[PDB]
Amino acid sequence: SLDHTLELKIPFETERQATIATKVLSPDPILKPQDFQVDYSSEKNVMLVQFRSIDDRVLRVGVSSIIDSIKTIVEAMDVLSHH
């Protein structure tokens, strides 16, 4: 059962930003679907990412990698937002 759970709520400046980030995110984990699952979405300006996993080690590997993608986007919306 996938009972090791972690949600990550990330605030952008606005709903559009949030929305676009989730489109762009497109994850694709190395981890088995049986062992690890992720759900992304956005509500207003917040991005919701919900992880579900077998145990803490799986969780750790999967969550860091995602966070990495996210940052990449925040980095990219940073440079664009300012020109």
Binding site: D3, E7, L8, D55, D56, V63, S64, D68, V74, E75
Partner: protein
Amino acid sequence: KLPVAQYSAPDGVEKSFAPQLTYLGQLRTQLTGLQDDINEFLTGRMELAKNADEKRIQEEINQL
């Protein structure tokens, strides 16, 4: 408001995380803050779980 995370585990543990430069610039760092937090926290749990060989022993004999 900042980025945040909230953790739950089947053994009754619940954990909450929470940590010029631009808004999103700051956001990006806070996220390495959190990424860290989370990575420390989970290894620490994996460590405590650790702290089997015998099990790997009984099988063998079984087959011998």
